[PDB]
Short mmCIF file of C-alpha atoms and ligand atoms in Angstrom, two decimals:
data_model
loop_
_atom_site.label_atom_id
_atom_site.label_comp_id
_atom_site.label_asym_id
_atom_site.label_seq_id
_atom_site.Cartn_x
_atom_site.Cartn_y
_atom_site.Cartn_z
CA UNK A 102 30.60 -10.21 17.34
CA UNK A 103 27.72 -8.39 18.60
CA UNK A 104 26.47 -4.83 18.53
CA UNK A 105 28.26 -1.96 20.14
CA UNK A 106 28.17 -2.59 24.48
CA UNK A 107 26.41 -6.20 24.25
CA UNK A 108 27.71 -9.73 25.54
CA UNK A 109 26.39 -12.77 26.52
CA UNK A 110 25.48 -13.76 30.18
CA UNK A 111 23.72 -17.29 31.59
CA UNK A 112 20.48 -16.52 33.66
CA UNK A 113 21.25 -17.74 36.91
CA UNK A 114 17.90 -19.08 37.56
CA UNK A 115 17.36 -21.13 34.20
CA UNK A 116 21.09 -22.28 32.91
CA UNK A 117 19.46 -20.29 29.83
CA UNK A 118 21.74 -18.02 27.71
CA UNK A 119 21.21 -14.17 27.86
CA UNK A 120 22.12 -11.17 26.55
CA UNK A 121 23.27 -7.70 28.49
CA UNK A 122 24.11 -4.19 27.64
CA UNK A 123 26.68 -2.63 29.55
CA UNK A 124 26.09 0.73 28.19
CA UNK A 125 22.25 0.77 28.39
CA UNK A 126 21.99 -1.78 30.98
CA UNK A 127 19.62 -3.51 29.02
CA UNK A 128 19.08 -7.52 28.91
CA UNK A 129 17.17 -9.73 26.90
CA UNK A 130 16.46 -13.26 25.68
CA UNK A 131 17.58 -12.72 22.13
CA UNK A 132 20.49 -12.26 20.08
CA UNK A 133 20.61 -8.23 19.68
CA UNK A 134 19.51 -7.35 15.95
CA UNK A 135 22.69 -6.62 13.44
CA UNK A 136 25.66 6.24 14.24
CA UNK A 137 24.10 9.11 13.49
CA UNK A 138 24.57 12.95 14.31
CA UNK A 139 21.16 12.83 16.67
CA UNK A 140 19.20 10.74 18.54
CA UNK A 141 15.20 11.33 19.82
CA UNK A 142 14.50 9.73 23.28
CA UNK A 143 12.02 9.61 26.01
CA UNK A 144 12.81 8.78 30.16
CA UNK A 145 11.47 8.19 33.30
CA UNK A 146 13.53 9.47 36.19
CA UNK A 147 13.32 8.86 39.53
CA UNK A 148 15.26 10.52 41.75
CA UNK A 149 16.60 9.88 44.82
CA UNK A 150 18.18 11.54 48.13
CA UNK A 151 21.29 11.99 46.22
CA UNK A 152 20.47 13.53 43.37
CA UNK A 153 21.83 16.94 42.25
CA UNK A 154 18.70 18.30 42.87
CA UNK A 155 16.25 16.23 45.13
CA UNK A 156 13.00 17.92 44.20
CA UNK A 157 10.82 17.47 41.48
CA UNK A 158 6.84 18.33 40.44
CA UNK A 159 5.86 15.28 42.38
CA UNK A 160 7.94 16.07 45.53
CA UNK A 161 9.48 19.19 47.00
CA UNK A 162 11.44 16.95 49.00
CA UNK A 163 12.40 13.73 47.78
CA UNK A 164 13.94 11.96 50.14
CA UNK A 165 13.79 7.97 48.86
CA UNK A 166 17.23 5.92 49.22
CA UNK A 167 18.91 5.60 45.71
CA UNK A 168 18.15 1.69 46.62
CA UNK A 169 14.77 2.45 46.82
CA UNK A 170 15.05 4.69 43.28
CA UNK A 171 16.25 1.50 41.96
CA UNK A 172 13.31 -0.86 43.26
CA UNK A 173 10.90 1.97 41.53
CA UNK A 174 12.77 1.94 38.13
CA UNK A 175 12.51 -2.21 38.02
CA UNK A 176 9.29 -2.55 38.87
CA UNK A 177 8.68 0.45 36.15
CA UNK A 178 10.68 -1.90 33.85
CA UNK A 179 8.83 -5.16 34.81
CA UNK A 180 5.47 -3.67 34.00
CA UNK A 181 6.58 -1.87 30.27
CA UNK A 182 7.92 -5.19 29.19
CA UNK A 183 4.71 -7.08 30.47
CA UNK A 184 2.47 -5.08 28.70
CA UNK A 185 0.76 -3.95 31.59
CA UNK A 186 1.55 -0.15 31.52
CA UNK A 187 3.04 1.29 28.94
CA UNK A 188 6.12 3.77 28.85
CA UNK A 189 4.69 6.95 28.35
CA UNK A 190 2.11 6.47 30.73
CA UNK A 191 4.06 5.74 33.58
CA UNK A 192 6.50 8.66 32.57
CA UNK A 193 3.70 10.99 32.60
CA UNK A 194 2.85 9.36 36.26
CA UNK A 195 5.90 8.62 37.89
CA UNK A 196 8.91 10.13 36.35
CA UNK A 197 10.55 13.21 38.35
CA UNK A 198 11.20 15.63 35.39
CA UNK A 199 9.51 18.22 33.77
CA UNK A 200 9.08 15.89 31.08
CA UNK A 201 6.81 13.96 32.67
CA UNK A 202 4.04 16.25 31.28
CA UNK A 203 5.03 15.59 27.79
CA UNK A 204 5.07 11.42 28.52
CA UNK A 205 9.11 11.72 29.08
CA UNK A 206 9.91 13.36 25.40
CA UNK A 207 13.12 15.04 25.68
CA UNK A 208 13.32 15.95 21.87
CA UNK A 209 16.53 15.29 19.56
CA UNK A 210 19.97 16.08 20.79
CA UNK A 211 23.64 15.37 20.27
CA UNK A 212 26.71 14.35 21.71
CA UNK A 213 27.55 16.97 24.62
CA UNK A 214 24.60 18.38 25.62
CA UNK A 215 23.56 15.29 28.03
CA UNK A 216 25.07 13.98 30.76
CA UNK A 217 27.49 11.57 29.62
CA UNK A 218 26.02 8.12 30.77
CA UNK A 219 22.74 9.29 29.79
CA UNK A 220 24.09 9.93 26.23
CA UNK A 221 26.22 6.93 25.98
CA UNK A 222 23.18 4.85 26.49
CA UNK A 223 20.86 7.12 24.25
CA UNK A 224 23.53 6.36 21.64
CA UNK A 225 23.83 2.93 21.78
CA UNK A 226 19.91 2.00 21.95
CA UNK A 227 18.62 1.33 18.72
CA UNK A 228 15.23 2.85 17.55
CA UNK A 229 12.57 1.74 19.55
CA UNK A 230 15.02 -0.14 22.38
CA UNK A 231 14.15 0.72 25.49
CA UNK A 232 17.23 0.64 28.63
CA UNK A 233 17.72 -0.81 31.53
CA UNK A 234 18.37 1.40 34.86
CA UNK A 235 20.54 4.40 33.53
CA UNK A 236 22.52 6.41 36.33
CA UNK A 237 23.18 9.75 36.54
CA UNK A 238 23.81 12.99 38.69
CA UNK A 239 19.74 13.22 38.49
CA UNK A 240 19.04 10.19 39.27
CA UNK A 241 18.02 7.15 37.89
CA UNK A 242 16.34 6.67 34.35
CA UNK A 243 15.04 4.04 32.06
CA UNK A 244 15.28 5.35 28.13
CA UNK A 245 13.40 5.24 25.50
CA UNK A 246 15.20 6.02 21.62
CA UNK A 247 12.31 7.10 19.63
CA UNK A 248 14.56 8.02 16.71
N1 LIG B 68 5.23 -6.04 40.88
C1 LIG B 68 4.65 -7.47 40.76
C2 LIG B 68 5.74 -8.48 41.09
O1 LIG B 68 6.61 -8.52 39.90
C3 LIG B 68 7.88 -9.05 40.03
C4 LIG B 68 8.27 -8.90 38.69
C5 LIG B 68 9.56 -9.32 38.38
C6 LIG B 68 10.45 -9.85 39.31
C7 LIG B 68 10.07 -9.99 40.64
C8 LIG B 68 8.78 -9.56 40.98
#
């Protein structure tokens, strides 16, 4: 039917028919459009109290609820697909890797050297798709395949 991790939803507030990811936990209006040894993407993490490691360059101590994490990363979202900020700048802002200082590129990688929900969604975005709220041991991220 559709594309690898997609099926159809109805928007709760509109009756209107929807589309969701469950392996990037993205969403959208449309019908998703129509894999290889590596994949290029950029994130924005934001970690929370229960992270692996709750420190970052913005915060020695980052003590935020993983609710709260959450609130951060869709109102991130909200504002990308606006049109009001865009991606990399709010990476280079907000997001609690190193990354941040290169706007959230991580470079190409492969199958194994991520963790695994990160990679599953890397895998399944399509160039230029952008996730919804990825979960991880770090935290959590939105993602960005740039190839
Ligand atoms: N941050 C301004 C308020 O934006 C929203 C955006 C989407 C859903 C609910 C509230």
């Amino acid at each position: 039917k559709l594309p690898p991790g997609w099926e159809k939803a109805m928007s709760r507030s509109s009756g209107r028919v929807y589309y969701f990811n469950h392996i990037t936990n993205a969403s959208q209006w449309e019908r998703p459009s129509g894999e290889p040894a590596r994949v290029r993407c950029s994130h924005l993490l934001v970690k929370h109290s229960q992270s692996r490691r709750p420190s970052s360059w913005r915060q020695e101590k980052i003590t935020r609820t993983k609710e709260e994490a959450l609130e951060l990363i869709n109102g991130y979202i909200q504002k990308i697909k606006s049109g009001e900020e865009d991606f990399e700048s709010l990476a280079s802002q907000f997001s609690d890797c190193s990354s941040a200082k290169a706007r959230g590129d991580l470079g190409a990688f492969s199958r194994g050297q991520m963790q695994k929900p990160f990679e599953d969604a890397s895998f399944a975005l399509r160039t230029g798709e952008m996730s919804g709220p990825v979960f991880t041991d770090s935290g959590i991220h939105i993602i960005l395949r740039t190839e």
